[PDB]
Amino acid sequence: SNSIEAKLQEDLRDALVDYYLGQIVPNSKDFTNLRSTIKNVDDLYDHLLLDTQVSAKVITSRLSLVTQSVQQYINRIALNLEPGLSINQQEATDWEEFANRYGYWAANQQLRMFPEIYVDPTLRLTKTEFFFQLESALNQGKLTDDVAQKAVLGYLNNFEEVSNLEIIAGYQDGIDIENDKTYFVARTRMQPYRYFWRSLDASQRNANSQELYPTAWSEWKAISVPLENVANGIVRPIMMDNR
Amino acid sequence: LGRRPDVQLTSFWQPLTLEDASYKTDSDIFMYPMNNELRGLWDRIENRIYNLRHNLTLDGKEINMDLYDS
Amino acid sequence: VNKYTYTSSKAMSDISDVIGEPLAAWDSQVGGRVFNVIFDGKVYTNTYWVERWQVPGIGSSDGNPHNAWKFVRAATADEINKIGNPTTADVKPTENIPSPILVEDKYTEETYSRPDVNFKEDGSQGNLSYTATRVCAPMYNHYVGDKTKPKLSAYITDWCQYDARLDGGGSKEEERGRGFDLATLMQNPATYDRLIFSFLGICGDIGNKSKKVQEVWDGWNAQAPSLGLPQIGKGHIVPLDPYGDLGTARNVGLPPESADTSIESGTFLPYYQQNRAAGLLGGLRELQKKAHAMGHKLDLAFSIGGWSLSSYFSALAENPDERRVFVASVVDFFVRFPMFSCVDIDWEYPGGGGDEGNISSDKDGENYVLLIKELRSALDSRFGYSNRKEISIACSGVKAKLKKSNIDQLVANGLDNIYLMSYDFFGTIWADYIGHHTNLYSPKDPGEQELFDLSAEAAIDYLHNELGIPMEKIHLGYANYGRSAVGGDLTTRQYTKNGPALGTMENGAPEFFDIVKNYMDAEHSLSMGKNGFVLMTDTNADADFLFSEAKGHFISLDTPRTVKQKGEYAAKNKLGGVFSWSGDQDCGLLANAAREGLGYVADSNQETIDMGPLYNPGKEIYLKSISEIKS
Amino acid sequence: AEKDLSRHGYIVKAADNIKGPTQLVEHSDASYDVIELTCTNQAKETITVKLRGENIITYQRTKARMVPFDNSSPFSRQLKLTFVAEDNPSLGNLDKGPYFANMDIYAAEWVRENVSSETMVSRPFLTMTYRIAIAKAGASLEELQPEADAFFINNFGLSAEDSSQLVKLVAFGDQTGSKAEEIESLLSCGENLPIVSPNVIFANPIFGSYFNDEPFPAPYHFGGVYINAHQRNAMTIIRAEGGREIQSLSNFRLERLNRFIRLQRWLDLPSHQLDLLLTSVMQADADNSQQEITEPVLKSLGLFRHLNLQYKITPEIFSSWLYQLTPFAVSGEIAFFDRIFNREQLFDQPFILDGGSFTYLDAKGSDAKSVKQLCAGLNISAVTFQFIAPLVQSALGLEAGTLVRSFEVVSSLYRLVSIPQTFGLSTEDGLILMNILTDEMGYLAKQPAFDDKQTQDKDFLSIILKMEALSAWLTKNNLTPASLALLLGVTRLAVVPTN
Amino acid sequence: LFPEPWDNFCRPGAIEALDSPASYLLDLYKFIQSVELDGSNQARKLETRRADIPKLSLDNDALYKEVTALSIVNDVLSGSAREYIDQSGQADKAVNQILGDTHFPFTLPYSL
């Protein structure tokens, strides 16, 4: 049986191992400073795949292991190890949310393919308290044509906020605003004054477009804490560290 | 109308390295016949038609009546 | 691939197996279709592609550069009546221009206007032009894989770099300099099979430029301790100008992105690696990337030594360990830039020659053989056969010193290739008489072909016959500049010694592209001498040249037709390979011609530009050999 | 296949009222011949016109250099004509034949043509039929020639104008009441490309040149030829525009197709075998050139219909009894000759059907070994095979005991093999019965054909009827054919005196 | 004609099939390659694709090929190391195996 030769490959493991410890450690022009790496398992991470003596005559896919190793790399970066471009957290989360697994990733791809088949926005990313107001309209009583009246009243007051607002504050981020996001702030033009903030990301347009993706501005998030008695009646925001 | 396209043909899936020196940003695609399921409208339509030719599972039976109690 | 069709008809009753074709007088036939045209009562078929200067008359057993525009004389007098028989003709430049050729340069016109330059088409007011290469057009057709034919190569140099006319300039020759973006060839890559950047050098070189060697050695020696790397002595190889090579964006086909041109000799050293390589060399790698995106990988190469940096060759001779350290620097470079298909050496004088700064002894040749063998050994010791490199050196064609080069032992020691310098035979500033600086072919009366009439074929035959070396290991090419000579008399080849001669930038060394601008043309689908400057060709040696009487100024130069002659010969030989020296200053038409000479075939019916009409000869004449004239 | 047509010439089709040459020449000082034609008025007044005629050829060649021109080969050959007022200026005559009569052309080759008294003579191989109009008024094509639209009503439900829409595949299927795939399969446009055995090389092999861009076998050369005029521009699927599309119009073909489909619905089998059959029957009498059905065709139809319904005979077998048999196959499908022979491969070389230039009397050359292999494929004793060999050679009129390569004799042989075993008859039983029937030997070897005259010896069809029926009667009698032949005295023996 | 004639203009998208990236999910190589360039946008103390000594765009058919042989593939990966070990001291003659039997640190046991 092949099992007979199936030892040789473990021997070959050992061979490589010694070629590492014996030759690489003193002859590594790579990694010449760095040492440690005393044990076989180490480089399976540091520069190799999860390359283990486990064999058991188990059939395995190049595709799959390459992927898994890619995952290794990703995670070695996800957790702070050897300095990696640890991307912004939302991207990292997407990695664990979808690229964590084929079917996970695959489904993500599926959606990103779909022009529309079943996106059916009975709910959606988009929101304003309009949405809960709407729901309230939906859930009150029994449905009727008049219900939209209430929705438009919602609209009314919200658009009151839209129209007559001290659109005067905000912040400009880095120099990247030729390409990306920054933030904005405004206030009621009448006391007792109220304040809100939103943002916009210039990446949301085509490479050659000047029209922009309808995602556009974030909402005018109402300020929570009391704000009054400010010397000039003007206030300053800034954002850092995703706060 | 049941307008139909051709197959998600093989063309020739080509085994070749992956780089923008190979893949192209332009500044092509790599199928298998599976991107479908959309046709369900047509499908249900056709079924309905066949169940006009007959009936959606079997054909039923009628009901009767009564006298003076009526 | 290209494809074309024609058709013929007959009465329904008659079916010729042959392609019937309309009987007609000859007149400016052309193309691929059958022609049986009649002339001088004879009837003529060019069983090969037809060209507007080609004539069936001479063609009876001629009419193409290789064989008969064959004929019969079946025509009767009444055929000679129904058709008005031709008996002589001359093709003219057409009135239209079938293709654009080039674009003017504001700054070059300004240059001509400069009160120092004072350049004029006739050169009367100004013997030099310093014309910017930017005048040039892309000029590359496209071609089939054609794998069997010998490889194609071109030389490349730092003179691509700068023309401060791009930077205003206006006062000095380099401000009126030359240079081009490799983007040019990038537009349609795989233009060649191999390339060779110009000869670089080593620490300890002796020639004029050695102050550069000093500077770069200083930068290195300063960086090395800070890098935590060993210091270097003489014999270590030099890049000459890493800031040019990498600290660049203009002329190097890449966005100014990441072009830290501020970096230089004192600072580049960490970047001195292909991965890090910005600028020129990195771009070369990227071009190779595009190339492979197509396929047919280029032999990327360069060399070291050469005409102006050979000086230390003798000095390094007989210093075996420093020679070792040098080749160590070679393999180190390989590791730093494993992209390279190969690189080579440009020793030029086994026996002394060229610039006198190249001090030399006799033993030089022997020592050179020995060290060469040792290089081979070291190389083999480094390389994996799957990725092996194989080395070449040029040769000067100096009938004796080439022998002194001991090619036999070099071959026996695995030097795989040789590139014969086939140009500048005419040392115009010092040569006794005018001659063709690049003639492959032996003129009649070979009695004086020793320092003159130096038909490269002679050395070729020495190598083949007198040394048994297979042609595979030897390569030939052409250069894209002629010679210019004052007061020459075409009858005697005597000429005005020392008198200043034409060059845009290099007197006595007229620059091809600018010749196309000024003296020669093709806009009217022909080889067209222009501006009163004579287009001319000699039957003795198949020689080709140009002249102007008002200054008795002569120009010896290769041509599309003449490089055709060359490549055709080389192809018939099935040489090891073909290349062009100074490829930096041809639009590429000569490269397309080189493809033709290689028999390298185009892949489409469309063109960047035509090429056939470029093969009409110039003013025919017979020039006596130097021996013939003196005898 | 096989046939060279590089010197073929277009021929005036024996026209009583049209003029032009009818014979070919090796050479003449003639750019074009000329043709003169009787024009005809609608009210049958008579008119005439004249035209130029054109043998024409065309060819491809890459631009290159240092390579000689015209490395000639047989290649594309084509025809056209032209009219000009210089040919005739009588014009302006709606009242005198804007519409006019047909024009018709033969297509022939002129070559050595005699069994022994050889001389270069012409024989046709194709016909071409045309009708032409003087568009004096530029009238409607159905103002002129107006019957077709009525026909398109009564068997196309639709107008000539509507026919334009038919080019759309869906319009086609819809008027057809039938699935487009059926048409596509009729057109073989699928991946089901034709196939052919390695063991045959067709002569005149103008195939495989860098310019022989046509696929081989061609459809207008195999599988569905009838759906086209044996003509290069076979209709096919073409790229979508306003949806997927059909190659091109040929109302002529379209009727032929409509007809075929109608038949096919009664023929049950797929189209390709049907084509093979109808083609073979067309081939069975060269008198026709219209590739049309005939009474004999009908006879063959009923013949197969009955035969196969009775005894599961395959169309291939049937058509093979009628004519040569396929070395071709569809994709995956297997050639008939190979299945008959190279099915078994008990030898160093699979016998190529291009082989057989030999002589069957002696077992010597490997060709004799082939003869053995062929006989074994025919499941026969080689000695009885050699009983047949002279008989068939004689039917061919071949001489010197020689074997000849051609499948044709092999086919006659195979018929002779098959016909008896179709009823359990021995080869020689078939011989006996054939003699009993025809009063002659070898008719089953004789190549089938059709004739106007009553000649039961050549009506193989009713011959077959009588054969099988009367052999069944012999079965009812439970007797050997030889015994019966002696009874009829068609076989005879001496009566030498003795003790 | 008919009043208000029906007109479901399935306006001509010339509908044609589209590749799933899940098939050939390895195209994930694209994403990660981009992310690799992002990683490459860091201080020069990081090995990036040269941390990836193991792989190359082996963009080939492998619908099924599974075996434990990838272990051996890891030996071929060791091929790289031995090649530089040759670049430390030349050899090309299966010496990595042959020398496998010769030295310290390990026993350096018998080779294949």
Tab-separated table of C-alpha atoms in Angstrom, chain C residues 138-432:
chain	number	residue	atom	x	y	z
C	138	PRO	CA	5.420	55.926	-33.171
C	139	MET	CA	5.844	54.071	-36.479
C	140	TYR	CA	5.437	50.381	-35.654
C	141	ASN	CA	3.355	47.980	-37.697
C	142	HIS	CA	2.315	44.665	-36.118
C	143	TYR	CA	3.426	41.123	-36.841
C	144	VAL	CA	2.872	37.364	-36.461
C	145	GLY	CA	4.576	35.134	-33.872
C	146	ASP	CA	7.096	33.903	-36.484
C	147	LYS	CA	8.968	31.855	-33.875
C	148	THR	CA	11.544	30.175	-36.108
C	149	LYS	CA	13.383	33.301	-37.154
C	150	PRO	CA	16.461	34.489	-35.225
C	151	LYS	CA	15.947	36.795	-32.274
C	152	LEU	CA	15.648	40.566	-32.575
C	153	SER	CA	17.349	43.011	-30.223
C	154	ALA	CA	18.042	46.678	-29.631
C	155	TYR	CA	20.478	48.773	-27.615
C	156	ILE	CA	19.244	51.417	-25.153
C	157	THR	CA	21.019	54.205	-23.271
C	158	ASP	CA	20.823	57.013	-20.748
C	159	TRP	CA	20.701	59.555	-23.544
C	160	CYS	CA	16.962	58.865	-23.492
C	161	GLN	CA	17.001	61.029	-20.392
C	162	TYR	CA	17.141	64.726	-20.886
C	163	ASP	CA	16.514	67.782	-23.034
C	164	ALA	CA	16.162	70.857	-20.906
C	165	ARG	CA	14.174	72.354	-23.767
C	166	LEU	CA	11.428	70.497	-21.931
C	167	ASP	CA	12.660	72.617	-19.034
C	168	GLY	CA	13.167	75.843	-20.980
C	169	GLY	CA	16.943	75.577	-21.256
C	170	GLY	CA	18.107	77.446	-24.346
C	171	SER	CA	21.800	78.060	-23.671
C	172	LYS	CA	23.657	74.745	-23.772
C	173	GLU	CA	23.651	71.517	-25.780
C	174	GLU	CA	22.052	69.400	-23.053
C	175	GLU	CA	19.461	72.103	-22.535
C	176	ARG	CA	18.928	71.389	-26.223
C	177	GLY	CA	19.403	67.714	-25.398
C	178	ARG	CA	17.699	64.539	-26.566
C	179	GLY	CA	15.530	61.904	-24.992
C	180	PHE	CA	12.357	59.921	-25.353
C	181	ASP	CA	9.801	58.070	-23.272
C	182	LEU	CA	9.859	54.306	-23.473
C	183	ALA	CA	6.085	54.748	-23.525
C	184	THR	CA	6.735	54.899	-27.272
C	185	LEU	CA	7.613	51.237	-27.600
C	186	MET	CA	5.265	50.435	-24.742
C	187	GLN	CA	2.416	51.469	-27.040
C	188	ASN	CA	3.099	48.320	-29.039
C	189	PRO	CA	5.538	46.174	-27.122
C	190	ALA	CA	7.339	42.979	-28.166
C	191	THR	CA	8.936	45.231	-30.742
C	192	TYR	CA	12.113	43.219	-30.150
C	193	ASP	CA	13.135	39.936	-28.617
C	194	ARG	CA	15.965	41.370	-26.529
C	195	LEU	CA	17.265	44.703	-25.311
C	196	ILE	CA	20.598	45.855	-23.966
C	197	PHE	CA	21.006	48.883	-21.787
C	198	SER	CA	24.282	50.668	-22.405
C	199	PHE	CA	27.541	49.517	-20.831
C	200	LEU	CA	27.831	50.510	-17.187
C	201	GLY	CA	30.946	50.059	-15.072
C	202	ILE	CA	32.886	49.323	-11.890
C	203	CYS	CA	34.864	51.008	-9.141
C	204	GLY	CA	38.388	51.971	-10.161
C	205	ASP	CA	37.722	52.834	-13.811
C	206	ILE	CA	40.223	55.192	-15.341
C	207	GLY	CA	38.620	57.113	-18.209
C	208	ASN	CA	37.433	60.713	-18.201
C	209	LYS	CA	34.072	59.898	-16.618
C	210	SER	CA	35.703	58.146	-13.656
C	211	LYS	CA	34.823	61.107	-11.455
C	212	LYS	CA	31.311	59.706	-11.682
C	213	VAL	CA	32.763	56.413	-10.496
C	214	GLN	CA	34.278	58.296	-7.597
C	215	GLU	CA	31.012	60.001	-6.689
C	216	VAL	CA	28.935	56.859	-6.758
C	217	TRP	CA	31.595	54.906	-4.903
C	218	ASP	CA	31.550	57.598	-2.247
C	219	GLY	CA	27.784	57.431	-1.940
C	220	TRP	CA	28.016	53.663	-1.662
C	221	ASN	CA	30.770	53.713	0.917
C	222	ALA	CA	28.816	56.224	2.963
C	223	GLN	CA	25.593	54.225	2.799
C	224	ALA	CA	27.150	50.804	3.423
C	225	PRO	CA	27.939	51.291	7.145
C	226	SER	CA	24.582	52.917	7.776
C	227	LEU	CA	22.985	50.045	5.900
C	228	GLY	CA	25.007	47.605	7.980
C	229	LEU	CA	26.623	46.266	4.854
C	230	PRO	CA	30.219	45.586	3.822
C	231	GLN	CA	32.285	48.224	2.080
C	232	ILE	CA	33.382	47.791	-1.522
C	233	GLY	CA	36.678	48.249	-3.313
C	234	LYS	CA	37.541	48.550	-6.967
C	235	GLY	CA	35.952	46.187	-9.459
C	236	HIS	CA	32.540	46.472	-7.844
C	237	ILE	CA	29.944	47.335	-10.472
C	238	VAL	CA	28.397	50.782	-10.837
C	239	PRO	CA	24.880	51.848	-11.903
C	240	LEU	CA	26.260	55.258	-13.014
C	241	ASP	CA	23.075	57.256	-12.229
C	242	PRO	CA	20.447	55.551	-10.083
C	243	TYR	CA	18.552	58.825	-9.861
C	244	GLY	CA	18.173	58.738	-13.615
C	245	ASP	CA	17.533	55.003	-13.606
C	246	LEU	CA	14.829	55.138	-10.972
C	247	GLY	CA	14.361	58.615	-9.533
C	248	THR	CA	12.356	59.489	-12.623
C	249	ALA	CA	8.858	59.692	-14.096
C	250	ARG	CA	9.179	61.723	-17.278
C	251	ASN	CA	10.522	59.684	-20.204
C	252	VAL	CA	9.818	56.466	-18.311
C	253	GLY	CA	6.212	55.638	-19.129
C	254	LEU	CA	4.997	55.872	-15.535
C	255	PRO	CA	2.976	58.408	-13.563
C	256	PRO	CA	4.930	60.840	-11.375
C	257	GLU	CA	3.456	58.789	-8.547
C	258	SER	CA	6.155	57.524	-6.183
C	259	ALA	CA	8.925	59.086	-8.331
C	260	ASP	CA	11.137	60.256	-5.437
C	261	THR	CA	13.529	61.867	-7.904
C	262	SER	CA	15.087	63.715	-4.960
C	263	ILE	CA	16.807	60.432	-4.087
C	264	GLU	CA	20.289	59.921	-5.531
C	265	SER	CA	23.678	58.177	-5.220
C	266	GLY	CA	24.017	59.040	-1.569
C	267	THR	CA	20.569	57.706	-0.761
C	268	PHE	CA	19.213	55.333	-3.426
C	269	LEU	CA	21.059	52.302	-2.152
C	270	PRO	CA	18.194	50.658	-0.217
C	271	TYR	CA	16.002	51.036	-3.273
C	272	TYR	CA	18.725	49.492	-5.423
C	273	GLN	CA	16.471	46.506	-6.119
C	274	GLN	CA	13.848	45.653	-8.716
C	275	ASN	CA	10.981	45.392	-6.236
C	276	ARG	CA	11.786	48.893	-5.042
C	277	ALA	CA	12.873	50.023	-8.506
C	278	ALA	CA	11.075	53.197	-9.570
C	279	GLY	CA	11.877	55.055	-12.750
C	280	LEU	CA	13.445	53.635	-15.881
C	281	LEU	CA	14.490	50.154	-14.770
C	282	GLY	CA	11.255	49.486	-12.919
C	283	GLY	CA	9.356	50.632	-15.970
C	284	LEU	CA	11.356	48.131	-17.989
C	285	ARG	CA	10.087	45.423	-15.692
C	286	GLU	CA	6.551	46.739	-16.120
C	287	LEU	CA	6.908	46.715	-19.874
C	288	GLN	CA	7.952	43.121	-19.569
C	289	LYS	CA	4.801	42.624	-17.514
C	290	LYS	CA	2.677	43.975	-20.347
C	291	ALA	CA	4.748	41.946	-22.765
C	292	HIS	CA	4.005	38.732	-20.924
C	293	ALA	CA	0.384	39.809	-20.730
C	294	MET	CA	0.664	39.240	-24.449
C	295	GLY	CA	3.277	36.438	-24.346
C	296	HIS	CA	6.630	35.964	-26.164
C	297	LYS	CA	8.878	37.095	-23.306
C	298	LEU	CA	11.669	39.562	-24.071
C	299	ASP	CA	15.302	38.818	-23.367
C	300	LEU	CA	15.825	41.729	-21.016
C	301	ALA	CA	19.526	42.501	-20.868
C	302	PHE	CA	22.261	45.099	-20.615
C	303	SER	CA	26.026	45.047	-20.533
C	304	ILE	CA	29.061	46.704	-18.955
C	305	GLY	CA	32.402	47.950	-20.283
C	306	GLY	CA	32.267	49.483	-23.695
C	307	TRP	CA	33.820	52.217	-25.746
C	308	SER	CA	34.067	54.809	-23.002
C	309	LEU	CA	34.236	52.736	-19.815
C	310	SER	CA	36.521	49.852	-20.843
C	311	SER	CA	39.571	51.526	-19.264
C	312	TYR	CA	39.780	49.277	-16.212
C	313	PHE	CA	39.620	46.042	-18.223
C	314	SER	CA	43.383	45.736	-18.367
C	315	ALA	CA	43.740	46.966	-14.795
C	316	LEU	CA	41.372	44.303	-13.502
C	317	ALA	CA	43.182	41.700	-15.577
C	318	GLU	CA	45.499	39.487	-13.498
C	319	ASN	CA	43.821	40.513	-10.227
C	320	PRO	CA	41.922	37.261	-9.822
C	321	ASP	CA	40.300	37.933	-6.481
C	322	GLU	CA	39.151	41.417	-7.413
C	323	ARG	CA	37.795	39.889	-10.604
C	324	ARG	CA	36.008	37.439	-8.318
C	325	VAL	CA	34.644	40.317	-6.245
C	326	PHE	CA	33.483	41.972	-9.436
C	327	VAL	CA	31.631	38.893	-10.656
C	328	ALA	CA	30.349	38.574	-7.118
C	329	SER	CA	28.870	42.020	-7.568
C	330	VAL	CA	27.458	40.642	-10.807
C	331	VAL	CA	25.610	37.825	-9.098
C	332	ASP	CA	24.601	40.206	-6.318
C	333	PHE	CA	23.043	42.392	-8.983
C	334	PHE	CA	21.306	39.307	-10.293
C	335	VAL	CA	19.820	38.713	-6.859
C	336	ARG	CA	18.831	42.365	-6.610
C	337	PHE	CA	17.237	42.239	-10.063
C	338	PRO	CA	16.336	38.617	-10.866
C	339	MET	CA	14.032	39.906	-13.600
C	340	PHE	CA	16.946	40.064	-16.014
C	341	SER	CA	17.087	37.602	-18.876
C	342	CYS	CA	20.845	38.169	-18.939
C	343	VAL	CA	23.541	40.849	-18.851
C	344	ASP	CA	26.957	40.863	-20.448
C	345	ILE	CA	30.316	42.586	-20.793
C	346	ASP	CA	31.687	45.026	-23.339
C	347	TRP	CA	35.419	44.478	-23.390
C	348	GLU	CA	36.525	45.995	-26.647
C	349	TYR	CA	40.293	45.656	-27.081
C	350	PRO	CA	42.158	42.385	-26.594
C	351	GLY	CA	44.878	44.245	-28.421
C	352	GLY	CA	44.891	47.937	-27.625
C	353	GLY	CA	42.586	50.221	-29.536
C	354	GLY	CA	39.939	52.861	-29.287
C	355	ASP	CA	40.493	55.413	-26.565
C	356	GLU	CA	44.099	55.438	-25.410
C	357	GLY	CA	42.937	55.599	-21.793
C	358	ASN	CA	42.174	51.911	-22.255
C	359	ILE	CA	45.706	50.966	-21.269
C	360	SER	CA	46.477	47.492	-22.555
C	361	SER	CA	49.092	44.781	-22.934
C	362	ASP	CA	49.364	41.737	-25.143
C	363	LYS	CA	48.607	39.272	-22.352
C	364	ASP	CA	45.302	41.117	-21.944
C	365	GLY	CA	43.666	38.778	-24.449
C	366	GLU	CA	44.888	35.614	-22.739
C	367	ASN	CA	44.047	36.910	-19.272
C	368	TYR	CA	40.681	37.960	-20.650
C	369	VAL	CA	40.063	34.434	-21.903
C	370	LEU	CA	41.051	33.012	-18.533
C	371	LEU	CA	38.897	35.320	-16.476
C	372	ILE	CA	36.075	34.800	-18.965
C	373	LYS	CA	36.226	31.076	-18.309
C	374	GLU	CA	36.274	31.844	-14.609
C	375	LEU	CA	33.196	34.034	-15.035
C	376	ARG	CA	31.412	31.181	-16.757
C	377	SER	CA	32.330	28.917	-13.869
C	378	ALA	CA	31.098	31.381	-11.255
C	379	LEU	CA	27.897	31.954	-13.185
C	380	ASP	CA	27.217	28.252	-13.434
C	381	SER	CA	27.917	27.953	-9.735
C	382	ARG	CA	25.250	30.499	-9.002
C	383	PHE	CA	22.482	29.836	-11.450
C	384	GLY	CA	19.807	27.213	-11.658
C	385	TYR	CA	19.666	25.705	-15.127
C	386	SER	CA	15.938	26.362	-15.302
C	387	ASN	CA	16.895	30.040	-15.053
C	388	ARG	CA	20.431	30.008	-16.455
C	389	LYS	CA	22.050	33.045	-18.047
C	390	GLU	CA	24.286	32.822	-21.074
C	391	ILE	CA	26.733	35.523	-21.934
C	392	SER	CA	27.910	37.344	-25.004
C	393	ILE	CA	30.495	39.867	-25.961
C	394	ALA	CA	30.689	42.086	-28.979
C	395	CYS	CA	33.558	42.114	-31.433
C	396	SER	CA	35.184	44.963	-33.312
C	397	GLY	CA	35.855	43.269	-36.625
C	398	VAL	CA	39.484	44.339	-36.339
C	399	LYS	CA	40.716	41.532	-38.583
C	400	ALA	CA	43.695	40.790	-36.322
C	401	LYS	CA	42.645	41.825	-32.819
C	402	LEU	CA	39.459	39.834	-33.237
C	403	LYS	CA	41.772	36.872	-33.704
C	404	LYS	CA	43.663	38.020	-30.628
C	405	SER	CA	40.324	37.689	-28.819
C	406	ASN	CA	40.690	33.847	-28.828
C	407	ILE	CA	36.998	33.260	-29.545
C	408	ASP	CA	37.761	29.561	-29.935
C	409	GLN	CA	38.627	29.180	-26.279
C	410	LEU	CA	35.811	31.484	-25.259
C	411	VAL	CA	33.399	29.110	-26.968
C	412	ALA	CA	35.214	26.179	-25.395
C	413	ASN	CA	34.531	27.988	-22.119
C	414	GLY	CA	30.844	28.527	-22.725
C	415	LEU	CA	30.617	32.131	-23.840
C	416	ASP	CA	27.517	31.624	-25.907
C	417	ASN	CA	27.203	34.688	-28.089
C	418	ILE	CA	29.007	37.389	-30.007
C	419	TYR	CA	27.676	40.632	-31.400
C	420	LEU	CA	29.658	42.060	-34.279
C	421	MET	CA	29.976	45.814	-34.254
C	422	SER	CA	28.969	46.523	-37.842
C	423	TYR	CA	29.173	50.302	-37.964
C	424	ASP	CA	31.325	53.435	-37.894
C	425	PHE	CA	33.995	51.687	-39.955
C	426	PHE	CA	34.494	55.163	-41.442
C	427	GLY	CA	36.446	57.054	-38.765
C	428	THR	CA	35.317	60.118	-40.660
C	429	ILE	CA	37.246	62.720	-38.687
C	430	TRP	CA	40.519	60.869	-39.149
C	431	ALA	CA	39.934	58.351	-41.942
C	432	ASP	CA	41.992	58.754	-45.119
